[PDB]
Ligand binder design. Structure first.
Ligand SMILES: Nc1ncnc2c1ncn2[C@@H]1O[C@H](CSCC[C@H](N)C(=O)O)[C@@H](O)[C@H]1O
Length: 173
């Protein structure tokens, strides 16, 4: 028979969210950048690491989701805008460094060229060697290898996620 809720249209599992938030160093003194917070399940796992709410910046395109996040997570620096336009959402880069980037934007909704460019821009705003972590659902990295720009590592696989979740991490080469 025909299954409902095909694809990835339910919130990410709490098991997956905790694993993505485990890359964070809450003792580094640097804020965290979250992309595409949605219902806030990964936001919760980020705050559970002990990040001060004012030190979490989360960029959400949907105005409906954004208005609800403001009311559910007091103190967190939510921004209503497009994560692929970091200049418009974060401002022109003038030195701000994030501890790490936690991304759940749906990479496959965008051209590969856009994904590579965004990743190259995000790695300018974290210290050399620190990660971007991305969730995806296919068998391969959602962002193709460009070894002169970044290094790809498989981070984890969570079969209890609906659908099963692959986690990838990226660092500056
Ligand atoms: N370019 C973009 N910039 C900011 N947010 C985006 C975006 N494209 C998609 N989004 C938002 O990213 C989220 C993808 S769904 C994942 C939501 C949540 N983090 C979870 O894991 O369950 C949606 O909330 C969507 O509105």
């Amino acid at each position: 028979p025909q299954p409902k809720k095909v694809g990835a249209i339910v919130p990410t599992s709490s098991i997956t969210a905790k694993k993505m938030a485990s890359v964070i160093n809450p003792h580094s003194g640097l804020p965290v950048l979250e992309l595409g917070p949605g219902t806030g399940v990964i936001t919760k796992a980020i705050l559970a690491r002990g990040i001060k709410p004012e030190s979490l910046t989360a960029i959400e395109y949907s105005t409906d989701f954004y208005n609800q996040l403001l009311r559910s997570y007091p103190g967190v620096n939510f921004v209503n805008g497009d994560a692929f336009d970091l200049d418009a959402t974060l401002g022109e880069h003038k030195g701000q460094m994030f501890d790490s980037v936690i991304s759940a934007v749906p990479m496959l909704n965008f051209p590969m060229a856009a994904r590579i460019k965004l990743l190259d821009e995000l790695l300018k705003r974290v210290p050399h060697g620190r990660p971007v972590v991305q969730i995806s659902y296919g068998p391969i990295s959602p962002i193709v290898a460009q070894p002169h720009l970044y290094h790809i590592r498989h981070f984890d696989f969570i079969v209890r996620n609906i659908p099963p979740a692959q986690l990838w991490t990226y660092t500056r080469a």
